[PDB]
Design an enzyme around this catalytic site. Structure first.
Site, PDB file in Angstrom:
ATOM      1  N   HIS B  63       0.782  -1.240   0.000  1.00 11.45           N
ATOM      2  CA  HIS B  63       0.000   0.000   0.000  1.00 11.45           C
ATOM      3  C   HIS B  63       0.807   1.280   0.000  1.00 11.45           C
ATOM      4  O   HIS B  63       0.466   2.250  -0.731  1.00 11.45           O
ATOM      5  CB  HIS B  63      -0.935   0.009   1.196  1.00 11.45           C
ATOM      6  CG  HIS B  63      -1.954  -1.051   1.108  1.00 11.45           C
ATOM      7  ND1 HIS B  63      -3.128  -0.885   0.408  1.00 11.45           N
ATOM      8  CD2 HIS B  63      -1.944  -2.328   1.548  1.00 11.45           C
ATOM      9  CE1 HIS B  63      -3.811  -2.016   0.447  1.00 11.45           C
ATOM     10  NE2 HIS B  63      -3.112  -2.908   1.128  1.00 11.45           N
ATOM     11  N   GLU B 134      -7.141  -3.565  -4.442  1.00 11.75           N
ATOM     12  CA  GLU B 134      -7.557  -4.377  -3.301  1.00 11.75           C
ATOM     13  C   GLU B 134      -8.858  -3.813  -2.780  1.00 11.75           C
ATOM     14  O   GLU B 134      -8.873  -2.724  -2.216  1.00 11.75           O
ATOM     15  CB  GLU B 134      -6.481  -4.456  -2.171  1.00 11.75           C
ATOM     16  CG  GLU B 134      -7.054  -5.339  -1.008  1.00 11.75           C
ATOM     17  CD  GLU B 134      -6.186  -5.541   0.202  1.00 11.75           C
ATOM     18  OE1 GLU B 134      -5.364  -4.651   0.512  1.00 11.75           O
ATOM     19  OE2 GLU B 134      -6.370  -6.607   0.875  1.00 11.75           O
ATOM     20  N   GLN B 146     -10.067  -2.780   5.924  1.00 12.98           N
ATOM     21  CA  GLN B 146     -10.752  -2.109   4.781  1.00 12.98           C
ATOM     22  C   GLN B 146     -11.931  -1.258   5.342  1.00 12.98           C
ATOM     23  O   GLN B 146     -12.682  -1.753   6.188  1.00 12.98           O
ATOM     24  CB  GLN B 146     -11.262  -3.137   3.769  1.00 12.98           C
ATOM     25  CG  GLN B 146     -10.208  -4.106   3.165  1.00 12.98           C
ATOM     26  CD  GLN B 146      -9.306  -3.468   2.108  1.00 12.98           C
ATOM     27  OE1 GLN B 146      -8.080  -3.638   2.125  1.00 12.98           O
ATOM     28  NE2 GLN B 146      -9.904  -2.698   1.210  1.00 12.98           N
ATOM     29  N   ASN B 224      -5.199 -13.959   6.722  1.00 10.59           N
ATOM     30  CA  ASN B 224      -5.741 -12.662   7.099  1.00 10.59           C
ATOM     31  C   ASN B 224      -7.012 -12.303   6.340  1.00 10.59           C
ATOM     32  O   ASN B 224      -7.029 -12.391   5.097  1.00 10.59           O
ATOM     33  CB  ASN B 224      -4.667 -11.596   6.861  1.00 10.59           C
ATOM     34  CG  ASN B 224      -3.349 -11.969   7.539  1.00 10.59           C
ATOM     35  OD1 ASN B 224      -2.302 -11.954   6.928  1.00 10.59           O
ATOM     36  ND2 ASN B 224      -3.438 -12.394   8.777  1.00 10.59           N
ATOM     37  N   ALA B 225      -8.063 -11.946   7.098  1.00 16.41           N
ATOM     38  CA  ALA B 225      -9.372 -11.548   6.559  1.00 16.41           C
ATOM     39  C   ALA B 225      -9.973 -12.670   5.697  1.00 16.41           C
ATOM     40  O   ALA B 225     -10.427 -12.472   4.563  1.00 16.41           O
ATOM     41  CB  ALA B 225      -9.278 -10.201   5.814  1.00 16.41           C
ATOM     42  N   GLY B 254       5.886 -12.758  11.145  1.00 18.19           N
ATOM     43  CA  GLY B 254       5.664 -13.448  12.427  1.00 18.19           C
ATOM     44  C   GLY B 254       4.644 -12.796  13.362  1.00 18.19           C
ATOM     45  O   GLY B 254       4.530 -13.164  14.537  1.00 18.19           O
ATOM     46  N   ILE B 255       3.902 -11.822  12.835  1.00 20.61           N
ATOM     47  CA  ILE B 255       2.843 -11.116  13.547  1.00 20.61           C
ATOM     48  C   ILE B 255       1.473 -11.369  12.891  1.00 20.61           C
ATOM     49  O   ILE B 255       0.513 -11.695  13.580  1.00 20.61           O
ATOM     50  CB  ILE B 255       3.119  -9.608  13.513  1.00 20.61           C
ATOM     51  CG1 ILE B 255       4.393  -9.274  14.308  1.00 20.61           C
ATOM     52  CG2 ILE B 255       1.901  -8.777  13.981  1.00 20.61           C
ATOM     53  CD1 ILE B 255       4.913  -8.059  13.806  1.00 20.61           C
ATOM     54  N   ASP B 279       2.426  -6.265   2.330  1.00 21.26           N
ATOM     55  CA  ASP B 279       1.148  -5.595   2.678  1.00 21.26           C
ATOM     56  C   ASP B 279       1.440  -4.367   3.537  1.00 21.26           C
ATOM     57  O   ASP B 279       0.682  -4.024   4.442  1.00 21.26           O
ATOM     58  CB  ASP B 279       0.202  -6.547   3.429  1.00 21.26           C
ATOM     59  CG  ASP B 279      -1.243  -6.017   3.523  1.00 21.26           C
ATOM     60  OD1 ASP B 279      -1.672  -5.130   2.725  1.00 21.26           O
ATOM     61  OD2 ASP B 279      -1.944  -6.491   4.419  1.00 21.26           O
TER      62      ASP B 279
HETATM   63  N1  LIG Z   1      -4.399  -5.382   5.601  1.00 22.32           N
HETATM   64  C1  LIG Z   1      -4.957  -6.556   6.288  1.00 22.32           C
HETATM   65  C2  LIG Z   1      -6.003  -6.132   7.329  1.00 22.32           C
HETATM   66  O1  LIG Z   1      -7.162  -5.644   6.680  1.00 22.32           O
HETATM   67  C3  LIG Z   1      -6.419  -7.295   8.275  1.00 22.32           C
HETATM   68  O2  LIG Z   1      -7.237  -6.805   9.340  1.00 22.32           O
HETATM   69  C4  LIG Z   1      -5.133  -7.944   8.836  1.00 22.32           C
HETATM   70  C5  LIG Z   1      -5.368  -8.971   9.943  1.00 22.32           C
HETATM   71  O3  LIG Z   1      -6.313  -9.913   9.517  1.00 22.32           O
HETATM   72  P1  LIG Z   1      -6.813 -11.091  10.482  1.00 22.32           P
HETATM   73  O4  LIG Z   1      -7.360 -10.560  11.747  1.00 22.32           O
HETATM   74  O5  LIG Z   1      -7.974 -11.834   9.823  1.00 22.32           O
HETATM   75  O6  LIG Z   1      -5.613 -12.072  10.675  1.00 22.32           O
HETATM   76  O7  LIG Z   1      -4.411  -8.424   7.645  1.00 22.32           O
HETATM   77  C6  LIG Z   1      -3.791  -7.345   6.954  1.00 22.32           C
HETATM   78  O8  LIG Z   1      -3.083  -6.568   7.924  1.00 22.32           O
HETATM   79 FE   LIG Z   2      -3.550  -4.885   1.680  1.00 24.30          FE
HETATM   80 FE   LIG Z   3      -6.185  -6.884   2.991  1.00 24.86          FE
END
Ligand SMILES: N[C@@H]1[C@@H](O)[C@H](O)[C@@H](COP(=O)(O)O)O[C@@H]1O
Ligand SMILES: [Fe+3]
Ligand SMILES: [Fe+3]
Ligand SMILES: N[C@@H]1[C@@H](O)[C@H](O)[C@@H](COP(=O)(O)O)O[C@@H]1O
Ligand SMILES: [Fe+3]
Ligand SMILES: [Fe+3]
Lengths: 392, 392
Positions: B63, B134, B146, B224-225, B254-255, B279
């Site tokens: 981004h 995205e 988002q 993620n998401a 790792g986070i 990301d």
């Molecule tokens: N840019 C995305 C976020 O939009 C999302 O919130 C995050 C954690 O996602 P999740 O809680 O499902 O692991 O992933 C990335 O950081």
């Molecule tokens: Fe993204």
């Molecule tokens: Fe995302």
């Protein structure tokens, strides 16, 4: 009778022989070759067309089937599992107990000890390799179909008593590491070369990693009665998949887990670190109905065995049918099938010198199957133990 | 200046050359050999001791960073990401938009089109390969960071407008297949050779399998998401792992996910089907603080970028640092690193003829790194774009 199996694709330890012969004498494999042996054989079996010779399958986690359950603690129990398990291609097994009152567990262990020792039915059918002690030392939070009122933290002195009662037959214990203070029982089992299988456990990943160092090496029915996978806290499921120090049991019925979940287990573990089991209970190979399992009533309809609250409770899976599903789920080789149904189990039980491959010197535990894993014929320590509709 | 890199372990498409030379002329790789080339070179670089030459890394999902965000929609935005991305070993990128009002998305796309077209800063630093759109066509149930009020179902005519505004620069779209009626936009993107990446989606496994047939081929930031993995309903997570028709992006900080979850992705996908991304958002490479991202305030402390409710919101990850973590998580080869940081991206973007391997004929996009993945020097289309503290 000395025995010769003629003109079959043979799945050996490391290859598939396109057309071969296996000769058997005094219970052991004496010849594996592409060419007809010179020596005379009392009975000769002419293998059907597209059939495959696999090493006999080994089921390390199975409660009952065909009306019988380990917990019943009679000679008839094991006469029946012994006799009937060859019909699903199983030539050896670990009779598996369940969470229950300690005296109920004692009776099951003594029965098995005495039935094996009797050397009557214990010479025929699938060989009782020993016992898988499943519970009671599990999590109250991951009981699944284990009777909740009998779950208790690990007790090394009570196990020690059980193993004396079992005459040393206990080969695997399923336990929750977080319910084992100081990994005391895990450390004890490692000392005694008894497999410590993590199962019915709500543990986190950190703790499972420490258990493996204390000697834990198996995971009981991957996906079932396990803390779920979260991508930031992998739990039992994520550790079982990504931690190379664990061999993972899996119930490949397409009901305990989705086909893609079965496939994930095969991708993550590889074919040397995954062991198909049935986890079957007494209604396997019977009809719809209600059956006792661990003192509870299990309602069997179709392929699903459920407690009254819809909790899955053991399986109705036949061992060969697990092979067929895994082939569908993953497109794996016949070699991989031999691994995940036989070889890995034997190696893990420390009995690869005598079971688990089509190899000269080993017990003649063998299954003839079709290209679709239907059982055609089973031999157990050199005796034909099952012959299907294709006789002649 | 023609350029020669001297005495380095080189990670080629298929091997690691223990000590070699790479010569560069008019922006392209002209020589890869174990032996000093005959031809004269204007500048020659003597590689430090245990260093490694990798193909320049390609970040397909990023981004912002260093105070800049794609959504800012100025020339300065891309002057900055262009200029500064070579410091983390990145030589090309897809500037990534976010869910936002359609006119905000239009401005970002037009800006990029005009900045690339300007051919000023767009000739230097990391090459803007195009755009990763995205959102906004994502799930209201998997918004993550988002902006929820701007999420809308897929609109093929609005995308068509966006792609005209972008001058054809949109190479990937992240969308939720269940929010794409009739897989209309997915079918459109497949037609146009634009990657359809499934992400911010609450879809089940059945639907994802149908999306892949309609042309979906990527998964956006695995874990993620995403709808979670359940062993009987694998969701987006289990389909992304077990479905071989999807290439999976992964944030290896790792986070965003646990080390064993990163390792699982590598086991399940293999090194040809996994693409490391950052990301990253605008606070990458700056200090603790609050920063705009998609119209929201992100509080950055340490390595964690969070919304006020503790939702993770982009990363602070540098591309080379992702490589280092993956090496720690999986013990993978230098070859695998080249794959998951460069080669797979190039192949997936259809630009492997010019990026993604240390190979004669390709753009001279290259990174010199230490055995620990620290960036020592970066070349972008033949020009040195970064030189660390080890100058001379
Ligand atoms: N840019 C995305 C976020 O939009 C999302 O919130 C995050 C954690 O996602 P999740 O809680 O499902 O692991 O992933 C990335 O950081
Ligand atoms: Fe993204
Ligand atoms: Fe995302
Ligand atoms: N014998 C076990 C049961 O005790 C357990 O309930 C079941 C389903 O487990 P889960 O709901 O966690 O998938 O697995 C096997 O059938
Ligand atoms: Fe169980
Ligand atoms: Fe069981």
């Amino acid at each position: 009778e000395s025995l010769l199996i003629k003109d079959i694709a043979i799945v050996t330890e490391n290859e598939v022989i396109k057309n071969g012969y296996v000769g058997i004498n005094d219970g052991k494999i004496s010849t594996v070759s592409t060419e007809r042996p010179k020596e005379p054989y009392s009975k000769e079996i002419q293998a059907p067309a597209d059939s495959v010779l696999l090493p006999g399958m080994i089921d390390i986690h199975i409660h009952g089937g065909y009306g019988a359950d380990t917990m019943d603690a009679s000679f008839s129990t094991l006469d029946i599992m012994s006799s009937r398990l060859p019909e699903e291609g199983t030539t050896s097994f670990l009779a598996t107990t369940i969470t229950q009152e300690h005296g109920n567990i004692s009776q099951a262990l003594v029965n098995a000890r005495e039935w094996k020792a009797a050397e009557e039915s214990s010479l025929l059918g699938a060989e009782l390799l020993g016992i898988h002690l499943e519970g009671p030392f599990v999590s109250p939070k991951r009981a699944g179909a284990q009777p909740k009122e009998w779950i208790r933290p690990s007790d090394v002195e009570l196990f020690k008593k059980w193993q004396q009662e079992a005459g040393g037959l206990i080969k695997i214990v399923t336990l929750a590491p977080e319910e084992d203070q100081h990994f005391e029982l895990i450390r004890h089992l490692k000392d005694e070369s008894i497999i410590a299988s993590m199962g019915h456990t709500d543990a986190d990943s950190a703790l499972l990693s420490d258990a493996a160092k204390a000697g834990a090496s198996h995971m009981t029915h991957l996906y079932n009665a396990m803390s779920p996978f979260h991508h930031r806290e992998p739990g039992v499921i994520g550790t079982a998949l990504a931690h190379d120090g664990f061999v993972t049991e899996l119930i490949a019925d397409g009901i305990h887990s989705h086909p893609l979940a079965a496939k994930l287990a095969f991708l993550a573990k590889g074919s040397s670190k995954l062991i198909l089991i049935t986890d079957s209970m007494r209604a396997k190979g019977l009809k719809d109905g209600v059956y006792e399992f661990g003192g509870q009533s299990v309602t069997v309809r179709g392929r699903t065995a459920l407690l009254s609250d819809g909790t899955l409770a053991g399986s109705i899976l036949k061992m060969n049918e697990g092979a067929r599903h895994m082939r569908e789920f993953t497109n794996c080789s016949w070699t991989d099938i031999a691994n995940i149904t036989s070889e890995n189990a034997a190696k893990q039980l420390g009995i690869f010198d005598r079971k688990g491959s089509v190899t000269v010197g080993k017990d003649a535990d063998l299954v003839i199957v079709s290209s679709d894993c239907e059982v055609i014929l089973t031999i157990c320590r050199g005796n034909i133990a099952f012959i299907s509709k294709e006789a002649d």
